[PDB]
């Protein structure tokens, strides 16, 4: 229930060390399905998910040519932004772009995106509803004017509310055995006598998909956040994700604490408690 | 599937 398709582009200048490096990756939900690296020896858009391999040679030739056209453009933008900001020829700079679309539980369109960044800062983006632009400064305003004279905004919507959505669905159905799956988290709790009066409880969640999950603690039924530590969701390396919440409790009172795990694969939320 | 046309900034 609820899906999305996203493309992420990153171009980095290397004055003196040859032409600029270009990397592109494509995701459906939390699964990466495509790759392209300007420095790799293949010079092909490559598959990173199994379901995408059922597409014929037409798709692969078209996506490769489209991603090579994309690199050349970003390569020109690097020289163009350097000029707008009156920057040195020898410094390394970064250009990034993200575009994609969201769909609800019923696969109907919800939101679209097209954002651009220079040196990790917002440069110019299409607004939330897709009908206008947001420029960060005077250089972005210069870009904004070329784009509106070239009627860019109208091209993107057509793609975000149509093509992006049409393919997202095509990918979800053809790869339904691994994209529409829901792997509930394998959970357990560990204990560590930290010292003379302290004790640490660690609540786990391993092998889950999609990455969306909430891990919270409660002391006597009340959200206990004091002396707790929650880590960022991290990838296992096999398509699944991991995460843990830990709390430091007074020695002898650990059964008053409980861990609550919420995830899409769990019909009912799990409540873990320390049982030796 | 990628967007085909991209305008320079």
């Amino acid at each position: 229930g609820s899906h999305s398709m996203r493309y992420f582009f990153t171009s980095v200048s290397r004055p003196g060390r040859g032409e600029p490096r270009f990397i592109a990756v494509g995701y459906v939900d939390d699964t990466q399905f495509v790759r392209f690296d300007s420095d790799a020896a293949s010079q092909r858009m490559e598959p990173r998910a199994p379901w995408i391999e059922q597409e014929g040679p037409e798709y692969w030739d078209g996506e490769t040519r489209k991603v090579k056209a994309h690199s050349q453009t970003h390569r020109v933008d690097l020289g163009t932004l350097r000029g707008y900001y009156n920057q040195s020829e020898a410094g390394s700079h970064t250009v990034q772009r993200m575009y994609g679309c969201d769909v609800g539980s019923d696969w109907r369109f919800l939101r679209g995106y097209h954002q651009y960044a220079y040196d990790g800062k917002d440069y110019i983006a299409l607004k939330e509803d897709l009908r206008s632009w947001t420029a960060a400064d005077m250089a972005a305003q210069t870009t904004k004017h070329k784009w509106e004279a070239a009627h860019v905004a109208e091209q993107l919507r057509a793609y975000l509310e149509g093509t992006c959505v049409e393919w997202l669905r095509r990918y979800l159905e053809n790869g339904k055995e691994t994209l529409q799956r829901t792997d509930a988290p394998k959970t357990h709790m560990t204990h560590h006598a930290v010292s003379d009066h302290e004790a640490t409880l660690r609540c786990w969640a391993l092998s889950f998909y999609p990455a969306e999950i909430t891990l919270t603690w409660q002391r006597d039924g009340e959200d206990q956040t004091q002396d707790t530590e929650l880590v960022e969701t991290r990838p296992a390396g096999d398509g699944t994700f991991q995460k843990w919440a830990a709390v430091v409790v007074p020695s002898g009172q650990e059964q008053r604490y409980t861990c609550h795990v919420q995830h899409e694969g769990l019909p009912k939320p799990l409540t873990l408690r320390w049982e030796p | 599937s990628l967007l085909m046309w991209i305008t320079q900034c």
Partner: T-cell receptor
Framework: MKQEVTQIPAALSVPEGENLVLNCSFT??????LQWFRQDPGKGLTSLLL?????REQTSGRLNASLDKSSGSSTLYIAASQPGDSATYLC?????????????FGRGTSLIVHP | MGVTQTPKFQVLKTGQSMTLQCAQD?????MSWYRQDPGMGLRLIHY???????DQGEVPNGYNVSRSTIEDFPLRLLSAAPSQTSVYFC????????????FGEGSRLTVLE
């Protein structure tokens, strides 16, 4: 399918001062743009008008074109024709989705405006 | 801002290899070559979407192209043949913006026995 541009009539002879209408149609509506050119014997091609898939009409002096993308057809209008307008008129389109970027030209319309 | 082709005219003997140049200073990602016989349509030879890549058009045989930089897109006849007598047009464009195609003046080649 595959894109196919067609221009009828193939040839066209008229007296000066008349208002001309040239046709250009295409079988695949998924286009990024449409462009009209002019070409005289033993010379290069001069671009006349460019109409993008968003916009539906462009003007340049006595010339004006209109794009009806959805119907797969464009019409070039030439006001008060002159002998200087005698030439071959070509129309072309660029693809929006195929990922090849290859344009598709029509056979062209041969025009001769007599004084 | 323009497309420049050289040479404008050229005579070759059968078997000669010749290179036709084509440059542009507008940062167009797309560059291409056509050949057109007297009173006939334009036919694509080869093309390119950026420095480092190229593609075959309708008639790639007997021709070779390179695209090491964004500014240039040369065309090479490996071994000139009488059948190659034609008018060669180079054409560039952005792969964005209006996508308008810009044609060079044309190069007139006649291959003789």
């Amino acid at each position: 399918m595959k894109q196919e541009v067609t221009q009828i009539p193939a040839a066209l002879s008229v007296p000066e001062g008349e208002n001309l209408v040239l046709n250009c149609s295409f079988t695949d509506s998924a286009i990024y743009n449409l462009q009209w050119f002019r070409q005289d014997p033993g010379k290069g091609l001069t671009s006349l008008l460019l109409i993008q898939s968003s916009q539906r009409e462009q003007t340049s002096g006595r010339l004006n074109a209109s794009l009806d993308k959805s119907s797969g057809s464009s019409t070039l209008y030439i006001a008060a024709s002159q002998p200087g307008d005698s030439a071959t008129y070509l129309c072309a389109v660029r693809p929006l989705l195929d990922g090849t970027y290859i344009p598709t030209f029509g056979r062209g319309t041969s025009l001769i405006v007599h004084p | 801002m323009g497309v420049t082709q050289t040479p404008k005219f050229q005579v070759l003997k059968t078997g000669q290899s010749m290179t036709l140049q084509c440059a542009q200073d507008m940062n167009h990602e797309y560059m291409s070559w056509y050949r057109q016989d007297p009173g006939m349509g334009l036919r694509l030879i080869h093309y390119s979407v950026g420095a480092g890549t190229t593609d075959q058009g309708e008639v790639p045989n007997g021709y070779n192209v390179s695209r090491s930089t964004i500014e240039d897109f040369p065309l090479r006849l490996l071994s000139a043949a009488p059948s190659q007598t034609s008018v060669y047009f180079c054409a560039s464009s952005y792969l964005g913006n209006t996508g308008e195609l810009f044609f060079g003046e044309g190069s007139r080649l006649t291959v003789l026995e």
